[PDB]
Amino acid sequence: YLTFKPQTFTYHDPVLRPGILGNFEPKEPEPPGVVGGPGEKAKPLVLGPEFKQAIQASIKEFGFNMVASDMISLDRSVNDLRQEECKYWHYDENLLTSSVVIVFHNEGWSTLMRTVHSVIKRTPRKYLAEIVLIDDFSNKEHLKEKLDEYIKLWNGLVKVFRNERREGLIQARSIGAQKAKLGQVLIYLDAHCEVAVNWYAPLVAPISKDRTICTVPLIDVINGNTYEIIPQGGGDEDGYARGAWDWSMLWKRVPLTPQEKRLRKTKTEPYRSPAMAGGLFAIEREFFFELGLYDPGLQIWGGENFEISYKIWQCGGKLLFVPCSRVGHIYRLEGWQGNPPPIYVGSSPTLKNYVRVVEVWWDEYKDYFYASRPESQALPYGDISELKKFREDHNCKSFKWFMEEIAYDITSHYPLPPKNVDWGEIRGFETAYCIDSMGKTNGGFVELGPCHRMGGNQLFRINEANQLMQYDQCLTKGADGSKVMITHCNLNEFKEWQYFKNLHRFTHIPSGKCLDRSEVLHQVFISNCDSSKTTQKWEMNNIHSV
Amino acid sequence: YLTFKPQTFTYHDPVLRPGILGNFEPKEPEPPGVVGGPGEKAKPLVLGPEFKQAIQASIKEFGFNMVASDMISLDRSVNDLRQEECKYWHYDENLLTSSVVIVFHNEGWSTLMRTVHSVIKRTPRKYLAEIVLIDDFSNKEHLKEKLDEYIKLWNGLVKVFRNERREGLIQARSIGAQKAKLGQVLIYLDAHCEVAVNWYAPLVAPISKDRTICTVPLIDVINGNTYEIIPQGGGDEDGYARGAWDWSMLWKRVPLTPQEKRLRKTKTEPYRSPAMAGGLFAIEREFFFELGLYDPGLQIWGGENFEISYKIWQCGGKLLFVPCSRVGHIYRLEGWQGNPPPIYVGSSPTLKNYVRVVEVWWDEYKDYFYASRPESQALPYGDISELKKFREDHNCKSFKWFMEEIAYDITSHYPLPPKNVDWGEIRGFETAYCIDSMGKTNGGFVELGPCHRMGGNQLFRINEANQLMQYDQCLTKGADGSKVMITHCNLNEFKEWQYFKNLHRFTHIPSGKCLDRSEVLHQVFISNCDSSKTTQKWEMNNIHSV
Ligand SMILES: [Mn+2]
Ligand SMILES: [Mn+2]
């Protein structure tokens, strides 16, 4: 019976006037911070080898080349990845005010400050209400005291709020929303971002017409090494993709559909996406609270982006990708040493968050999730009561509506999975050896190892469709081999195992052969079945860790 | 006219008497160090999860599960991986005495001491002359002082010699040979080894008949996490394999050939291998000096193992794998740290070592090496004069003899490579973007990136045979895509590129398509040929490393 507050605010949708440009486009080229280079305007900065040993160090500390970043201006210019028609939209000038919240943890100085400098340089002043930095219990000394003094520049426009304990990224974002009173809309940004020219007007205009639209900018890639900016490779060409997921709830992207394109008169106007990546988005501040922010059961590193996406869509909102508003996000490099917090019940925290989102939102679909991850089936996912009552009090639409009206494409790229026959370890009958993946993927060979019952790479499942699978990958027969190999699976590919529980037999269907192994050397292979080997007898047991 | 000092020892080859045991086989089963567990007799030790936080720490420090090793006896018993008929060989007892040298650097205590305990427990006392530990400049405190005092246990049988600077593994082994004077033969062992029962007699008997035979034991795998022992998966039906190399000089193993089997009366007697893995072997001490030990130009790593193998074979020696003598070596796990020295730019000095071995030993073969690695072609490999004079003074046989008389089977598994047409970066014509691999292998897609001229993943080569290759892998075209992908390669596979330097064109041969790129985002694809396009224009330039 509950509703959302009504739209008091009046706004006019923008108009596209080809060949006439403005009103939010800067008339003349943006002044470089340093003229010219090192890194303007997003021309790559390639260094070394004199800088080699220094660069690798900072990569260990930050996962980014801070050596380069340190010699690029905090006020650098940047390249325009925007489509041309973008330059010809005339916006109302009546946009809601914004607070941008940037959560950070141990962020390198120059990447965090260039982010803030980026926002100040390219957002019209009236609209920028405050920039709230949420320190999620930082370690490093340059982010305390030195930061407090520096921020005095900007005359109190920019504020920082420490967290007593490390709350985690999802909950940190919730605190941000609380700590940022001044703006009408919340604009969230990762702490290693560079925002593009005229990002704001296109981003905030759809929220203005309608307070239950949530806006996401197109997110572009900034090289961790070179600091050049590139768009993501997905979809449309133009290159418009909308956010999706497979049924283990991993984020995937898919091309913008013709069907959506039909809904829109012009190429560059916002479009509907079923879900957001998660780190950067815009909602009206009240409306976010009306959805109760982020489920406060998600511990860390959720799980977060999907929860809000379903809430907004199934409770009467829209989530829209705005092509005309672009933001660069720096992407990490190998060799970083920033580490997971210890957890006794694992990998409970993230997996547990996925189960929370599914159970409340997915409805009948939870079945697809549970056969992609059976390991999660009986996981203590916690109290979900108020979250289910919320959904019922606001008469929110079903996930089934969602999947057929707004998320129609997904099953075309990520097909529904077949139910499971069984899952768990594949252990040697009355032995303590298990088929162990070894983390091998795409072409490598599966081995035997001492059972640990910890799931992980000793966990498998059997399809009704006769696929033997670990994560996304299936095992099949190596050619020319009796060797069992792990590769990428497609719905009708490698339908070649059948498991008889009583027999203790896995049998390859195209040959006649039965799974068999050698205890030393630790090897797994298929040979003509002989009862009384007694290798070739296996059991499958649910791991079911708590 | 230089010659090796002749044999003066008279020794006789052992005799196999089936069904009669002895004479070096232990009479009764080996007593466990701790009765009732854990780790004996090489049962796997499976811990956790109470231990997991602790285990992951020690893996960071050592690359071994030290918490598991720490609770296994230094005197444990292990499993017998030897063939049964190994038990029935009767050896003379006339054998030579031996100094075992164990180089170490920051080795975990319990793995280093269990090695020594292993040797003391299973070597007959008369034959064990000393155990010389070479400390290559370790910093961990448990390896100093605590070690000196513990070692007093063996009444001075065991001795350790510190190195003033970290000399590196190869040179450390040379110092060992100098510092260990007592034995007639040198037995080298990695510092994380467990030697099998009756390893010694079979290992040292062939050196005894003939002072220019060099012996290698079969090297078995000790799991670095649960410490059960597994033989390596190697070709022979009996699991016997002989050491090889591809033409980039990467160590490889191949199955024991039928021809070698005709040469031998028995399944279990020693056999010829063209080269040794490197860490564990046995030579008569004088004879090693007569070969001038290890080329003192070899830098920290990159065998070295090959150098000695060619010396012994081409200067009148034999290198023999002894099945009956087995040694377990612990194999590392991911997560170590675990780190290279900073020297620029050999690069690497390791590549510099390979060129030293090739230039002196390979002869006309150096051509195969140089097209597998052209990057090495003009690398300052250093003074090689005395090493070439050695080969000439001793009248050493040609590599060509070597490859057709003793290493005939290599080119059957690792074919000679086709000459190169060009090699280097693949750069965009009058741009600063280069095709680069991103380190991608086996199925992934090759991208564009800012040129750095550092070789590495922006280095490629083109075959006479029309293969575009990086390391062992090839580029082909993977549909439905028009993207270019890397996979593993075979001599007649993916013969599909031709490069015209003047044209600035790479063209796909099966389609008519030409290599093309989009500068943003950085993408590489093959597209219909057009001459208008500046993309589709490429140079290939030798990157030279000094
Ligand atoms: Mn991030
Ligand atoms: Mn080693």
Side-chain angles (χ1 to χ4, degrees), chain B residues 153-181:
Chain B
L153 204 199
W154 290 292
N155 295 144
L157 217 264
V158 183
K159 21 186 101 108
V160 61
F161 291 124
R162 270 52 205 228
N163 284 344
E164 284 148 17
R165 33 119 87 195
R166 167 128 203 232
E167 296 288 330
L169 176 89
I170 303 170
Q171 304 305 325
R173 285 196 192 116
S174 282
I175 299 165
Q178 317 183 298
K179 264 147 173 333
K181 300 161 146 237

PDB file of all heavy atoms in Angstrom, chain B residues 153-181:
ATOM      1  N   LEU B 153      75.174 -31.703  16.296  1.00  0.00           N
ATOM      2  CA  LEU B 153      74.498 -32.967  16.501  1.00  0.00           C
ATOM      3  C   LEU B 153      75.122 -34.090  15.808  1.00  0.00           C
ATOM      4  O   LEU B 153      74.987 -35.210  16.197  1.00  0.00           O
ATOM      5  CB  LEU B 153      73.089 -32.873  15.958  1.00  0.00           C
ATOM      6  CG  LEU B 153      71.936 -33.735  16.426  1.00  0.00           C
ATOM      7  CD1 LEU B 153      70.899 -33.667  15.380  1.00  0.00           C
ATOM      8  CD2 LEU B 153      72.320 -35.159  16.634  1.00  0.00           C
ATOM      9  N   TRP B 154      75.722 -33.797  14.699  1.00  0.00           N
ATOM     10  CA  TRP B 154      76.287 -34.813  13.872  1.00  0.00           C
ATOM     11  C   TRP B 154      77.768 -34.853  13.988  1.00  0.00           C
ATOM     12  O   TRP B 154      78.414 -35.306  13.122  1.00  0.00           O
ATOM     13  CB  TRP B 154      75.849 -34.623  12.468  1.00  0.00           C
ATOM     14  CG  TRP B 154      74.442 -34.918  12.243  1.00  0.00           C
ATOM     15  CD1 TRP B 154      73.871 -36.084  12.306  1.00  0.00           C
ATOM     16  CD2 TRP B 154      73.456 -34.003  11.888  1.00  0.00           C
ATOM     17  NE1 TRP B 154      72.570 -35.988  12.024  1.00  0.00           N
ATOM     18  CE2 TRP B 154      72.296 -34.690  11.751  1.00  0.00           C
ATOM     19  CE3 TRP B 154      73.450 -32.654  11.675  1.00  0.00           C
ATOM     20  CZ2 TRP B 154      71.154 -34.097  11.409  1.00  0.00           C
ATOM     21  CZ3 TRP B 154      72.341 -32.087  11.360  1.00  0.00           C
ATOM     22  CH2 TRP B 154      71.200 -32.787  11.215  1.00  0.00           C
ATOM     23  N   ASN B 155      78.287 -34.357  15.092  1.00  0.00           N
ATOM     24  CA  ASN B 155      79.682 -34.439  15.441  1.00  0.00           C
ATOM     25  C   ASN B 155      80.568 -33.959  14.342  1.00  0.00           C
ATOM     26  O   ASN B 155      81.674 -34.428  14.189  1.00  0.00           O
ATOM     27  CB  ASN B 155      80.053 -35.856  15.803  1.00  0.00           C
ATOM     28  CG  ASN B 155      79.359 -36.329  17.034  1.00  0.00           C
ATOM     29  OD1 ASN B 155      78.989 -37.489  17.140  1.00  0.00           O
ATOM     30  ND2 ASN B 155      79.168 -35.431  17.976  1.00  0.00           N
ATOM     31  N   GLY B 156      80.122 -32.960  13.614  1.00  0.00           N
ATOM     32  CA  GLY B 156      80.976 -32.356  12.622  1.00  0.00           C
ATOM     33  C   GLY B 156      80.948 -33.020  11.285  1.00  0.00           C
ATOM     34  O   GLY B 156      81.728 -32.695  10.434  1.00  0.00           O
ATOM     35  N   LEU B 157      80.046 -33.961  11.117  1.00  0.00           N
ATOM     36  CA  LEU B 157      79.764 -34.561   9.830  1.00  0.00           C
ATOM     37  C   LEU B 157      79.213 -33.508   8.895  1.00  0.00           C
ATOM     38  O   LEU B 157      79.489 -33.496   7.719  1.00  0.00           O
ATOM     39  CB  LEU B 157      78.735 -35.663  10.016  1.00  0.00           C
ATOM     40  CG  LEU B 157      78.821 -36.936   9.201  1.00  0.00           C
ATOM     41  CD1 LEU B 157      77.925 -36.843   7.991  1.00  0.00           C
ATOM     42  CD2 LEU B 157      80.250 -37.171   8.778  1.00  0.00           C
ATOM     43  N   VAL B 158      78.390 -32.636   9.445  1.00  0.00           N
ATOM     44  CA  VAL B 158      77.695 -31.633   8.687  1.00  0.00           C
ATOM     45  C   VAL B 158      78.349 -30.300   8.930  1.00  0.00           C
ATOM     46  O   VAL B 158      78.637 -29.946  10.040  1.00  0.00           O
ATOM     47  CB  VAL B 158      76.232 -31.572   9.098  1.00  0.00           C
ATOM     48  CG1 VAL B 158      75.477 -30.583   8.252  1.00  0.00           C
ATOM     49  CG2 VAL B 158      75.607 -32.919   8.947  1.00  0.00           C
ATOM     50  N   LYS B 159      78.560 -29.552   7.879  1.00  0.00           N
ATOM     51  CA  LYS B 159      79.268 -28.309   7.953  1.00  0.00           C
ATOM     52  C   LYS B 159      78.625 -27.294   7.073  1.00  0.00           C
ATOM     53  O   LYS B 159      78.083 -27.631   6.109  1.00  0.00           O
ATOM     54  CB  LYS B 159      80.716 -28.490   7.533  1.00  0.00           C
ATOM     55  CG  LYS B 159      81.001 -29.684   6.691  1.00  0.00           C
ATOM     56  CD  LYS B 159      82.446 -29.873   6.450  1.00  0.00           C
ATOM     57  CE  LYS B 159      82.999 -30.938   7.351  1.00  0.00           C
ATOM     58  NZ  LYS B 159      83.313 -32.176   6.608  1.00  0.00           N
ATOM     59  N   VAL B 160      78.706 -26.031   7.424  1.00  0.00           N
ATOM     60  CA  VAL B 160      78.132 -24.976   6.636  1.00  0.00           C
ATOM     61  C   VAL B 160      79.138 -23.901   6.413  1.00  0.00           C
ATOM     62  O   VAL B 160      79.892 -23.605   7.253  1.00  0.00           O
ATOM     63  CB  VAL B 160      76.935 -24.364   7.316  1.00  0.00           C
ATOM     64  CG1 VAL B 160      77.329 -23.777   8.617  1.00  0.00           C
ATOM     65  CG2 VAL B 160      76.330 -23.314   6.462  1.00  0.00           C
ATOM     66  N   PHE B 161      79.090 -23.303   5.249  1.00  0.00           N
ATOM     67  CA  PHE B 161      80.026 -22.303   4.746  1.00  0.00           C
ATOM     68  C   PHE B 161      79.169 -21.166   4.215  1.00  0.00           C
ATOM     69  O   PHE B 161      78.350 -21.387   3.314  1.00  0.00           O
ATOM     70  CB  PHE B 161      80.931 -22.883   3.652  1.00  0.00           C
ATOM     71  CG  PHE B 161      81.940 -23.915   4.152  1.00  0.00           C
ATOM     72  CD1 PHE B 161      81.999 -25.195   3.603  1.00  0.00           C
ATOM     73  CD2 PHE B 161      82.829 -23.604   5.180  1.00  0.00           C
ATOM     74  CE1 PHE B 161      82.921 -26.149   4.077  1.00  0.00           C
ATOM     75  CE2 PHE B 161      83.746 -24.540   5.649  1.00  0.00           C
ATOM     76  CZ  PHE B 161      83.793 -25.812   5.098  1.00  0.00           C
ATOM     77  N   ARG B 162      79.312 -19.975   4.805  1.00  0.00           N
ATOM     78  CA  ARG B 162      78.582 -18.779   4.392  1.00  0.00           C
ATOM     79  C   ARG B 162      79.233 -18.160   3.168  1.00  0.00           C
ATOM     80  O   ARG B 162      80.446 -18.247   2.991  1.00  0.00           O
ATOM     81  CB  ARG B 162      78.589 -17.739   5.511  1.00  0.00           C
ATOM     82  CG  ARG B 162      77.446 -17.809   6.498  1.00  0.00           C
ATOM     83  CD  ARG B 162      77.291 -19.195   7.072  1.00  0.00           C
ATOM     84  NE  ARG B 162      75.928 -19.444   7.542  1.00  0.00           N
ATOM     85  CZ  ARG B 162      75.620 -19.969   8.728  1.00  0.00           C
ATOM     86  NH1 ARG B 162      76.584 -20.325   9.584  1.00  0.00           N
ATOM     87  NH2 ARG B 162      74.347 -20.147   9.052  1.00  0.00           N
ATOM     88  N   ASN B 163      78.437 -17.474   2.367  1.00  0.00           N
ATOM     89  CA  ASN B 163      78.963 -16.728   1.243  1.00  0.00           C
ATOM     90  C   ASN B 163      78.844 -15.255   1.558  1.00  0.00           C
ATOM     91  O   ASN B 163      77.834 -14.825   2.071  1.00  0.00           O
ATOM     92  CB  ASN B 163      78.215 -17.077  -0.036  1.00  0.00           C
ATOM     93  CG  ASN B 163      78.624 -18.413  -0.598  1.00  0.00           C
ATOM     94  OD1 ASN B 163      79.646 -18.957  -0.224  1.00  0.00           O
ATOM     95  ND2 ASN B 163      77.828 -18.946  -1.492  1.00  0.00           N
ATOM     96  N   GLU B 164      79.895 -14.494   1.294  1.00  0.00           N
ATOM     97  CA  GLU B 164      79.935 -13.071   1.637  1.00  0.00           C
ATOM     98  C   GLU B 164      78.888 -12.241   0.920  1.00  0.00           C
ATOM     99  O   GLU B 164      78.321 -11.322   1.479  1.00  0.00           O
ATOM    100  CB  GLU B 164      81.318 -12.498   1.374  1.00  0.00           C
ATOM    101  CG  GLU B 164      82.343 -12.883   2.418  1.00  0.00           C
ATOM    102  CD  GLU B 164      83.728 -13.018   1.832  1.00  0.00           C
ATOM    103  OE1 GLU B 164      83.948 -12.506   0.717  1.00  0.00           O
ATOM    104  OE2 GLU B 164      84.594 -13.632   2.484  1.00  0.00           O
ATOM    105  N   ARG B 165      78.645 -12.581  -0.331  1.00  0.00           N
ATOM    106  CA  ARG B 165      77.629 -11.954  -1.145  1.00  0.00           C
ATOM    107  C   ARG B 165      76.759 -13.059  -1.659  1.00  0.00           C
ATOM    108  O   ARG B 165      77.117 -14.210  -1.562  1.00  0.00           O
ATOM    109  CB  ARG B 165      78.208 -11.161  -2.322  1.00  0.00           C
ATOM    110  CG  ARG B 165      79.485 -11.684  -2.962  1.00  0.00           C
ATOM    111  CD  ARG B 165      79.298 -12.040  -4.428  1.00  0.00           C
ATOM    112  NE  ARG B 165      79.483 -10.913  -5.334  1.00  0.00           N
ATOM    113  CZ  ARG B 165      79.096 -10.891  -6.612  1.00  0.00           C
ATOM    114  NH1 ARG B 165      78.495 -11.936  -7.156  1.00  0.00           N
ATOM    115  NH2 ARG B 165      79.307  -9.818  -7.353  1.00  0.00           N
ATOM    116  N   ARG B 166      75.598 -12.715  -2.180  1.00  0.00           N
ATOM    117  CA  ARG B 166      74.739 -13.716  -2.735  1.00  0.00           C
ATOM    118  C   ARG B 166      75.328 -13.970  -4.081  1.00  0.00           C
ATOM    119  O   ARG B 166      75.215 -13.175  -4.975  1.00  0.00           O
ATOM    120  CB  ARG B 166      73.340 -13.175  -2.880  1.00  0.00           C
ATOM    121  CG  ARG B 166      72.455 -14.033  -3.735  1.00  0.00           C
ATOM    122  CD  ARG B 166      71.156 -14.367  -3.042  1.00  0.00           C
ATOM    123  NE  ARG B 166      70.581 -15.578  -3.590  1.00  0.00           N
ATOM    124  CZ  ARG B 166      69.340 -15.674  -4.024  1.00  0.00           C
ATOM    125  NH1 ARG B 166      68.538 -14.634  -3.967  1.00  0.00           N
ATOM    126  NH2 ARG B 166      68.904 -16.812  -4.513  1.00  0.00           N
ATOM    127  N   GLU B 167      75.964 -15.117  -4.202  1.00  0.00           N
ATOM    128  CA  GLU B 167      76.632 -15.530  -5.436  1.00  0.00           C
ATOM    129  C   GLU B 167      75.672 -16.104  -6.483  1.00  0.00           C
ATOM    130  O   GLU B 167      76.065 -16.248  -7.642  1.00  0.00           O
ATOM    131  CB  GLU B 167      77.738 -16.566  -5.131  1.00  0.00           C
ATOM    132  CG  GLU B 167      78.916 -16.074  -4.265  1.00  0.00           C
ATOM    133  CD  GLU B 167      79.850 -15.112  -5.015  1.00  0.00           C
ATOM    134  OE1 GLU B 167      79.975 -15.242  -6.263  1.00  0.00           O
ATOM    135  OE2 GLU B 167      80.442 -14.215  -4.363  1.00  0.00           O
ATOM    136  N   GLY B 168      74.470 -16.477  -6.102  1.00  0.00           N
ATOM    137  CA  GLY B 168      73.573 -17.067  -7.062  1.00  0.00           C
ATOM    138  C   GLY B 168      73.701 -18.561  -7.033  1.00  0.00           C
ATOM    139  O   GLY B 168      74.688 -19.087  -6.572  1.00  0.00           O
ATOM    140  N   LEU B 169      72.684 -19.240  -7.524  1.00  0.00           N
ATOM    141  CA  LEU B 169      72.602 -20.682  -7.445  1.00  0.00           C
ATOM    142  C   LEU B 169      73.654 -21.459  -8.214  1.00  0.00           C
ATOM    143  O   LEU B 169      74.138 -22.462  -7.737  1.00  0.00           O
ATOM    144  CB  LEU B 169      71.215 -21.119  -7.863  1.00  0.00           C
ATOM    145  CG  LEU B 169      70.960 -22.607  -7.928  1.00  0.00           C
ATOM    146  CD1 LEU B 169      70.477 -23.083  -6.576  1.00  0.00           C
ATOM    147  CD2 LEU B 169      69.913 -22.873  -8.993  1.00  0.00           C
ATOM    148  N   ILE B 170      73.968 -21.036  -9.427  1.00  0.00           N
ATOM    149  CA  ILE B 170      74.995 -21.711 -10.196  1.00  0.00           C
ATOM    150  C   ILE B 170      76.367 -21.568  -9.577  1.00  0.00           C
ATOM    151  O   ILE B 170      77.074 -22.533  -9.398  1.00  0.00           O
ATOM    152  CB  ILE B 170      75.121 -21.067 -11.583  1.00  0.00           C
ATOM    153  CG1 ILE B 170      73.803 -21.093 -12.318  1.00  0.00           C
ATOM    154  CG2 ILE B 170      76.178 -21.750 -12.419  1.00  0.00           C
ATOM    155  CD1 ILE B 170      73.837 -20.270 -13.577  1.00  0.00           C
ATOM    156  N   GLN B 171      76.777 -20.350  -9.295  1.00  0.00           N
ATOM    157  CA  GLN B 171      78.074 -20.124  -8.691  1.00  0.00           C
ATOM    158  C   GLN B 171      78.179 -20.642  -7.282  1.00  0.00           C
ATOM    159  O   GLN B 171      79.242 -20.948  -6.810  1.00  0.00           O
ATOM    160  CB  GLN B 171      78.498 -18.682  -8.792  1.00  0.00           C
ATOM    161  CG  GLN B 171      78.515 -18.159 -10.215  1.00  0.00           C
ATOM    162  CD  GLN B 171      79.361 -18.976 -11.164  1.00  0.00           C
ATOM    163  OE1 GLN B 171      80.386 -19.513 -10.798  1.00  0.00           O
ATOM    164  NE2 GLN B 171      78.933 -19.055 -12.394  1.00  0.00           N
ATOM    165  N   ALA B 172      77.063 -20.695  -6.593  1.00  0.00           N
ATOM    166  CA  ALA B 172      77.021 -21.273  -5.279  1.00  0.00           C
ATOM    167  C   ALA B 172      77.390 -22.735  -5.333  1.00  0.00           C
ATOM    168  O   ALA B 172      78.093 -23.227  -4.488  1.00  0.00           O
ATOM    169  CB  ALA B 172      75.643 -21.105  -4.711  1.00  0.00           C
ATOM    170  N   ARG B 173      76.907 -23.431  -6.344  1.00  0.00           N
ATOM    171  CA  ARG B 173      77.250 -24.829  -6.544  1.00  0.00           C
ATOM    172  C   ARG B 173      78.731 -24.991  -6.839  1.00  0.00           C
ATOM    173  O   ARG B 173      79.345 -25.967  -6.397  1.00  0.00           O
ATOM    174  CB  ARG B 173      76.433 -25.440  -7.666  1.00  0.00           C
ATOM    175  CG  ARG B 173      74.982 -25.747  -7.364  1.00  0.00           C
ATOM    176  CD  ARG B 173      74.439 -26.702  -8.429  1.00  0.00           C
ATOM    177  NE  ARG B 173      72.989 -26.767  -8.318  1.00  0.00           N
ATOM    178  CZ  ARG B 173      72.146 -26.352  -9.257  1.00  0.00           C
ATOM    179  NH1 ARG B 173      72.621 -25.877 -10.407  1.00  0.00           N
ATOM    180  NH2 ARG B 173      70.833 -26.435  -9.049  1.00  0.00           N
ATOM    181  N   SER B 174      79.334 -24.036  -7.563  1.00  0.00           N
ATOM    182  CA  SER B 174      80.775 -24.123  -7.821  1.00  0.00           C
ATOM    183  C   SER B 174      81.579 -23.983  -6.529  1.00  0.00           C
ATOM    184  O   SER B 174      82.549 -24.719  -6.295  1.00  0.00           O
ATOM    185  CB  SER B 174      81.211 -23.061  -8.843  1.00  0.00           C
ATOM    186  OG  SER B 174      80.888 -23.436 -10.171  1.00  0.00           O
ATOM    187  N   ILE B 175      81.179 -23.047  -5.671  1.00  0.00           N
ATOM    188  CA  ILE B 175      81.833 -22.877  -4.379  1.00  0.00           C
ATOM    189  C   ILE B 175      81.716 -24.146  -3.558  1.00  0.00           C
ATOM    190  O   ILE B 175      82.624 -24.501  -2.803  1.00  0.00           O
ATOM    191  CB  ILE B 175      81.211 -21.689  -3.626  1.00  0.00           C
ATOM    192  CG1 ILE B 175      81.385 -20.385  -4.406  1.00  0.00           C
ATOM    193  CG2 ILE B 175      81.797 -21.623  -2.246  1.00  0.00           C
ATOM    194  CD1 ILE B 175      80.499 -19.293  -3.909  1.00  0.00           C
ATOM    195  N   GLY B 176      80.605 -24.831  -3.704  1.00  0.00           N
ATOM    196  CA  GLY B 176      80.350 -26.020  -2.946  1.00  0.00           C
ATOM    197  C   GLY B 176      81.365 -27.049  -3.267  1.00  0.00           C
ATOM    198  O   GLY B 176      81.833 -27.735  -2.416  1.00  0.00           O
ATOM    199  N   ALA B 177      81.653 -27.196  -4.537  1.00  0.00           N
ATOM    200  CA  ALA B 177      82.592 -28.182  -5.007  1.00  0.00           C
ATOM    201  C   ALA B 177      83.966 -27.901  -4.480  1.00  0.00           C
ATOM    202  O   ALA B 177      84.706 -28.795  -4.185  1.00  0.00           O
ATOM    203  CB  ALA B 177      82.600 -28.195  -6.509  1.00  0.00           C
ATOM    204  N   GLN B 178      84.334 -26.644  -4.422  1.00  0.00           N
ATOM    205  CA  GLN B 178      85.562 -26.240  -3.785  1.00  0.00           C
ATOM    206  C   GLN B 178      85.568 -26.491  -2.281  1.00  0.00           C
ATOM    207  O   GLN B 178      86.562 -26.878  -1.733  1.00  0.00           O
ATOM    208  CB  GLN B 178      85.881 -24.792  -4.142  1.00  0.00           C
ATOM    209  CG  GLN B 178      85.623 -24.522  -5.610  1.00  0.00           C
ATOM    210  CD  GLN B 178      85.970 -23.132  -6.077  1.00  0.00           C
ATOM    211  OE1 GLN B 178      85.412 -22.145  -5.626  1.00  0.00           O
ATOM    212  NE2 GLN B 178      86.871 -23.056  -7.021  1.00  0.00           N
ATOM    213  N   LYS B 179      84.458 -26.268  -1.634  1.00  0.00           N
ATOM    214  CA  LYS B 179      84.469 -26.280  -0.208  1.00  0.00           C
ATOM    215  C   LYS B 179      84.280 -27.660   0.350  1.00  0.00           C
ATOM    216  O   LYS B 179      84.304 -27.847   1.550  1.00  0.00           O
ATOM    217  CB  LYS B 179      83.454 -25.294   0.334  1.00  0.00           C
ATOM    218  CG  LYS B 179      84.108 -23.976   0.652  1.00  0.00           C
ATOM    219  CD  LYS B 179      83.202 -22.795   0.435  1.00  0.00           C
ATOM    220  CE  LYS B 179      83.842 -21.520   0.930  1.00  0.00           C
ATOM    221  NZ  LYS B 179      84.824 -21.733   2.022  1.00  0.00           N
ATOM    222  N   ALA B 180      83.978 -28.600  -0.509  1.00  0.00           N
ATOM    223  CA  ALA B 180      83.736 -29.927  -0.060  1.00  0.00           C
ATOM    224  C   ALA B 180      84.755 -30.802  -0.613  1.00  0.00           C
ATOM    225  O   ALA B 180      84.703 -31.152  -1.724  1.00  0.00           O
ATOM    226  CB  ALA B 180      82.406 -30.363  -0.547  1.00  0.00           C
ATOM    227  N   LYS B 181      85.694 -31.180   0.206  1.00  0.00           N
ATOM    228  CA  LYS B 181      86.902 -31.744  -0.263  1.00  0.00           C
ATOM    229  C   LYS B 181      87.032 -33.179   0.018  1.00  0.00           C
ATOM    230  O   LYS B 181      87.792 -33.842  -0.593  1.00  0.00           O
ATOM    231  CB  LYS B 181      88.021 -31.064   0.450  1.00  0.00           C
ATOM    232  CG  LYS B 181      88.058 -29.584   0.215  1.00  0.00           C
ATOM    233  CD  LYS B 181      88.851 -28.819   1.247  1.00  0.00           C
ATOM    234  CE  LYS B 181      89.544 -27.644   0.619  1.00  0.00           C
ATOM    235  NZ  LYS B 181      91.007 -27.688   0.844  1.00  0.00           N
TER     236      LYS B 181
END
